[PDB]
Amino acid sequence: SGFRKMAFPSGKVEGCMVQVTCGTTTLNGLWLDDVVYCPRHVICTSEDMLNPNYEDLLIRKSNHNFLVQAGNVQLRVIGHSMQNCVLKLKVDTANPKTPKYKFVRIQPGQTFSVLACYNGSPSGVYQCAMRPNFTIKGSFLNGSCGSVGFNIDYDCVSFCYMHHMELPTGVHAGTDLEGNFYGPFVDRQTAQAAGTDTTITVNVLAWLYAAVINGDRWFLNRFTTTLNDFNLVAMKYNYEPLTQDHVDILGPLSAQTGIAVLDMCASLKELLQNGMNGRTILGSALLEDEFTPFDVVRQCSGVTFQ
Amino acid sequence: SGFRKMAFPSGKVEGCMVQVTCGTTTLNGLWLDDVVYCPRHVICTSEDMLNPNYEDLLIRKSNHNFLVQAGNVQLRVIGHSMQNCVLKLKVDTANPKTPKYKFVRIQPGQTFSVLACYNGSPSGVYQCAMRPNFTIKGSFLNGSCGSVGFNIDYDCVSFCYMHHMELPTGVHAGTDLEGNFYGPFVDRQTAQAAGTDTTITVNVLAWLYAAVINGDRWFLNRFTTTLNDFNLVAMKYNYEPLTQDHVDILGPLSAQTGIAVLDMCASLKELLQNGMNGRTILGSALLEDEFTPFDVVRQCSGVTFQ
Numbered sequence: 373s374g375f376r377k378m379a380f381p382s383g384k385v386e387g388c389m390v391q392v393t394c395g396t397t398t399l400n401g402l403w404l405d406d407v408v409y410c411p412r413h414v415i416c417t418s419e420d421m422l423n424p425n426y427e428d429l430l431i432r433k434s435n436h437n438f439l440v441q442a443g444n445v446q447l448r449v450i451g452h453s454m455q456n457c458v459l460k461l462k463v464d465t466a467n468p469k470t471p472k473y474k475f476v477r478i479q480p481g482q483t484f485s486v487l488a489c490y491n492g493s494p495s496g497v498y499q500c501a502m503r504p505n506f507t508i509k510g511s512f513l514n515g516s517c518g519s520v521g522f523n524i525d526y527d528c529v530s531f532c533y534m535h536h537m538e539l540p541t542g543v544h545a546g547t548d549l550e551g552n553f554y555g556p557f558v559d560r561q562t563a564q565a566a567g568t569d570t571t572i573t574v575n576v577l578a579w580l581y582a583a584v585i586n587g588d589r590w591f592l593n594r595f596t597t598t599l600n601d602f603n604l605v606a607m608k609y610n611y612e613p614l615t616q617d618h619v620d621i622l623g624p625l626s627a628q629t630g631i632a633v634l635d636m637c638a639s640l641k642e643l644l645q646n647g648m649n650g651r652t653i654l655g656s657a658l659l660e661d662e663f664t665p666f667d668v669v670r671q672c673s674g675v676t677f678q
Numbered sequence: 679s680g681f682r683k684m685a686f687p688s689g690k691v692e693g694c695m696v697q698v699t700c701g702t703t704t705l706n707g708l709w710l711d712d713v714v715y716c717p718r719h720v721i722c723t724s725e726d727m728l729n730p731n732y733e734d735l736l737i738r739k740s741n742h743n744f745l746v747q748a749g750n751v752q753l754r755v756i757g758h759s760m761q762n763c764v765l766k767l768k769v770d771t772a773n774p775k776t777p778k779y780k781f782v783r784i785q786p787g788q789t790f791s792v793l794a795c796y797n798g799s800p801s802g803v804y805q806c807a808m809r810p811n812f813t814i815k816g817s818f819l820n821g822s823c824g825s826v827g828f829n830i831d832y833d834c835v836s837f838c839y840m841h842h843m844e845l846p847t848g849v850h851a852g853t854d855l856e857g858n859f860y861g862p863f864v865d866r867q868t869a870q871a872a873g874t875d876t877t878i879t880v881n882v883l884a885w886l887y888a889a890v891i892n893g894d895r896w897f898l899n900r901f902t903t904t905l906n907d908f909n910l911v912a913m914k915y916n917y918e919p920l921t922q923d924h925v926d927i928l929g930p931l932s933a934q935t936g937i938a939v940l941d942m943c944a945s946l947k948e949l950l951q952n953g954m955n956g957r958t959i960l961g962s963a964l965l966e967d968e969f970t971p972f973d974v975v976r977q978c979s980g981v982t983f984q
């Protein structure tokens with residue numbers, strides 16, 4: 373037993389990370405088959421990034437202005453094109469270590485692992501959640517753009533995120549692997565505001581179930597509320613409203629622990645109004661919303677991957 | 679910027695994990711060169727584990743009673759021996775993916791990554807700290823024994839931990855790769871008590887420096903204390919005493935931020951007596967002691983590995 377903010381094993385992703393240089397700008401790219409994917413602002417200079425005209429900038433570039441290195445092995449660029457906010461560089465070699473993979477656009481509240489990289493080389497791995505305002509609260513230094521986020525399904529990698537920028541507020545924004553930004557952000561250096569960040573209620577609930585599974589039950593109370601009246605309290609504290617799909621997703625956690633979703637909601641209700649009063653839950657003095665119901669089930673049953 | 683509890687990339691370790699079976703007991707082993715390392719309680723039955731006589735049990739076993747699988751590839755066991763609490767199985771094949779590696783016995787308070795495994799297959803990765811009482815607070819289910827903890831130094835893996843058992847209290851105990859337990863635990867199913875768990879003061883201090891680096895400075899106060907008088911407060915709250923080596927290790931964090939170690943100690947002093955009063959620091963409502971000074975420097979400068 374025990375409970376940890378666990379990330380997916382990163383081995384299959386390490387072998388896909390390359391270093392992309394264009395001009396004096398260097399960042400990370402993702403090498404699958406014979407295509408290298410990277411942020412298109414790699415073609416920007418320091419001055420260009422305030423008001424970049426990407427089509428006009430991309431015109432001045434030819435295949436040989438792009439240097440791609442995979443460790444010590446040089447790749448040769450044969451074609452290049454812009455798909456939304458990512459560049460696709462066709463190279464002469466297919467990545468031998470290309471894993472079975474898929475591109476996926478995740479939804480707010482889902483979780484994934486980030487492999488933070490510099491100069492094409494892997495630095496560290498952490499788990500995080502797509503916030504409801506389509507940002508992530510990550511850990512990125514200069515040079516980490518093109519680092520990717522991913523899930524693993526047995527032997528299959530699902531790439532869902534590419535890092536593009538840090539907002540003046542210290543949070544992080546990026547795209548899917550087709551280059552569409554998550555959220556209303558653009559790849560230019562201007563003031564851009566994220567919305568109100570809210571708490572992911574269904575994840576908190578999944579975490580309470582994890583805590584019951586692991587011996588923390590002090591917060592269980594003898595009260596039963598309704599969905600309307602919980603959501604009425606939820607909205608007051610900047611919590612995402614709970615819907616029926618959310619209750620359905622929690623069904624197996626309900627079944628394994630004998631506690632109805634609505635009863636768990638009533639416990640959360642009380643913590644929101646009264647607080648935790650110094651106590652802790654699974655080690656934490658705050659409510660935690662970076663585990664999905666699937667994460668809890670995976671962790672508490674020991675799902676593995678190739 | 680930002681700050682995350684980051685783990686090391688696990689790729690180099692994934693390729694070393696095999697599945698070891700003896701009788702009906704299956705667990706994980708570590709395959710480096712032509713030796714497989716695993717917990718010796720693999721040779722125990724369900725009844726044996728209360729009062730195991732390992733030498734007498736190991737006598738009834740021969741090379742062919744040990745089945746080692748690396749994915750679908752079977753390994754053949756040629757020799758076998760017991761070194762303290764680990765078994766060493768000599769196999770006929772050297773692991774092709776053997777990375778440059780070293781065995782190391784870490785000290786309490788150092789951190790490392792755990793690759794949690796089942797049936798020889800990688801499940802997930804998390805960072806943790808060796809507590810001062812030589813336990814770790816991990817996330818392990820039945821079948822995870824022989825999972826290992828490790829650090830990476832550029833292209834070199836430092837194995838420091840092998841998982842052996844969960845205590846009746848829900849915490850986790852294990853050995854180095856030479857089979858010596860960390861702490862006074864034995865590999866038998868009896869009540870074993872860990873000592874008092876204390877907080878790792880030098881790590882907390884490193885984390886305060888990280889927080890100053892990332893914009894959290896509300897806890898900075900205009901007070902200066904002495905080492906004796908801080909330690910006198912430290913011991914009252916179950917904090918590890920601070921020594922001069924500890925102050926020396928923090929020197930570069932002091933230099934980069936302009937804040938003297940002793941001044942930071944005085945800030946911590948106040949949080950210990952007064953609390954955080956609802957506020958948070960780097961996202962957390964508790965003081966955090968699972969980052970070493972080296973972790974903070976690595977994260978805040980973007981150190982990478984092969």
Ligand SMILES: *[C@@H]1CC(=O)N(CC)C1=O
Pocket residue numbers: 472473474525527528529
């Ligand atoms: C993994 C491998 C693959 O092609 N798929 C299809 C959806 C996977 O899920």
Ligand SMILES: *[C@@H]1CC(=O)N(CC)C1=O
Pocket residue numbers: 778779780831833834835
């Ligand atoms: C990594 C590779 C190796 O043999 N060493 C010696 C200490 C390392 O640090």
Ligand SMILES: *[C@H]1CC(=O)N(CC)C1=O
Pocket residue numbers: 397398399514515516517536537
């Ligand atoms: C990485 C991401 C980013 O914004 N830059 C500046 C050009 C990088 O190099």
Ligand SMILES: *[C@H]1CC(=O)N(CC)C1=O
Pocket residue numbers: 703704705820821822823842843
């Ligand atoms: C893994 C670790 C442990 O104690 N067991 C029971 C025999 C395992 O199989």
